Subunit: 175 residues, 2 copies
């Protein structure tokens, strides 16, 4: 594999920040579209409920930044739901990405519309010091899982659920 990389949400070498800067015009388009969704609802204007009528949001739009805690994205909370015997120290950061590369490696725009009231978050848990030695013979390794998040299709002006790899833990594996 020449160019190979799993790529976790918010992954970035320079202190894990932003790679490129999405056009404000795009953010504008998204805000508008999300507002359109909220209005086609109207009823139940108390919270996320304004989005709960649209099929895609119902399917994968529930990683609400307001409710998602870090433990919800630890590997033990994703199938197979098992705990690590030994896990290395973990660096945890909330992630609210505007872009992501799917499981298939494609580039996608992940929907974030703070003004409209729709924000998606998934806390990332990575090996604190990369892959250092840890067992009596082990190695610190990044484990991942997969989350589905609402993305925005620029062409067809439509929403869609897509799969992204998320960093859930750092088990000390025997290499």
């Amino acid at each position: 594999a020449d160019t190979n990389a799993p790529i976790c949400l918010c992954d970035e070498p320079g202190v894990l920040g932003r790679t490129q800067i999405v056009t404000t015009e795009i953010k504008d388009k998204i805000e508008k579209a999300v507002e359109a969704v909220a209005q086609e609802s109207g009823v139940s204007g108390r919270g996320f409920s304004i989005f709960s009528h649209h099929p895609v949001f119902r399917e994968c739009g529930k990683y609400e930044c307001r409710t998602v805690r870090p433990e919800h994205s630890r590997c033990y909370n994703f199938p197979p739901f098992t705990h690590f015997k030994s896990e290395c120290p973990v660096s945890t950061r909330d992630c609210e990405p505007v872009f992501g590369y799917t499981v298939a490696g494609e580039f996608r725009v992940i929907v974030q519309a703070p003004r409209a009231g729709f924000r998606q978050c998934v806390w990332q848990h990575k090996c604190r010091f990369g892959s250092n030695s840890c067992g009596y013979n082990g190695r610190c390794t990044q484990q991942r899982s997969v989350v589905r998040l609402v993305t925005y299709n620029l062409e067809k002006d439509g929403f869609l659920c897509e799969s992204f790899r998320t960093c859930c833990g750092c088990p000390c594996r025997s290499f």
Copy 2:
């Protein structure tokens, strides 16, 4: 009177995982307060922090463990930023304090929330062998400096910056 063994951030058997009064009851309260900031903040970027949108954190949240280097707490990194002519031998230890005494002598809980992505580190540089003769007429002296760290005010259960003395070096104080 003088003392060969100076007192620094992380000194005395009180600073530990459990620690003095820093009950798992307090710890948890702090963790959730930090998570709330992460959840409402969201704002992030390279060479930044997700906490830089909150006023207390933008002011004194820069001793985050992932960015801190041992030399960042050496005396020459604090005003008047001057180097020593002769410095006695130093013992450098990492320090991630859970409580401390402010420059005004008050006890304060120093925020440490590993699970929400906020840890504070200030490496202590102590006189390896204190007070012993070093120069012609000098005596090895613990040099302290002042650092501001995010604290948790019990009363108003919120965040506040406070000033703490930190051990930055051990100059041979001759004359």
